[PDB]
Design a binder for these strands. Sequence first.
DNA 1: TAACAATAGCAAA
DNA 2: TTGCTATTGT
Lengths: 143, 142
Amino acid sequence: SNENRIQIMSTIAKIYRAMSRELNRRLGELNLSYLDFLVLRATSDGPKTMAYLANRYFVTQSAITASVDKLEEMGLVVRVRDREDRRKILIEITEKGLETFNKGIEIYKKLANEVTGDLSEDEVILVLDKISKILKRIEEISQ
Amino acid sequence: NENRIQIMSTIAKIYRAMSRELNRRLGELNLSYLDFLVLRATSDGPKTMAYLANRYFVTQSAITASVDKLEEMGLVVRVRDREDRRKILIEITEKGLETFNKGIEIYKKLANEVTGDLSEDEVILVLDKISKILKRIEEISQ
DNA sequence: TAACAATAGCAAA
DNA sequence: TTGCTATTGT
């Protein structure tokens, strides 16, 4: 019960933010921003409406349109009319977009590996065990 | 390995769950979690909107909204930079520093609760190890 | 005929 | 940025 406890939590918070910043930069190698990547992730398992996209990531509708426009011009997704109500527009991922998405996943996995490089396989297991308990408690609380 | 990826995935889950609960609890002080983070950043000196948006990885507009709320509640104020009077720096007020302090109490209580299954030693061990993860991310971010 | 979606072109001030 | 407004499709 020391100030070390709040330090663990704010360090975890700092890691999330820094990782997000670094992943965003590395995604630039595929000409994608982190959001562009998230739109591809969301459409990877099926077409989605613009509203679903905006709500899904708590982002403005406009930000979603810009991302889609960029992805469309890059041939990563296409706007298509909803077959059940052709007045609606769905964002559908293309084969290229799907392959670009998978490369984004590889970039993430590589970064995630790199970042824990100073830890041995045993330290990794130990850490995972400890923070998994932290996860369990916060989820029980914030249910 | 997958365990290494699992660490980052678990950290992500913890952050999202913690952010959600902190937003709920900080509401007691009429603060959002982001408002709190803005206060936290300006507690040690004035900061620019761009700076705030980058550090917490959020849109610059979100910072604006947060800032407006904080300013109206008289927790922060926008003042011209002595270096360049055309660049606005977000400065915190004594009231904001006192409000921030109350936010730390809430944060500390949740932190103690959430790490409750960990002994003092385990805490030191976890903290040392994840501190290395963060330091590693920063070296690579240069 | 009316109503519901989306979009491009005009406003706001 | 938001918020109409006229127009094309369902």
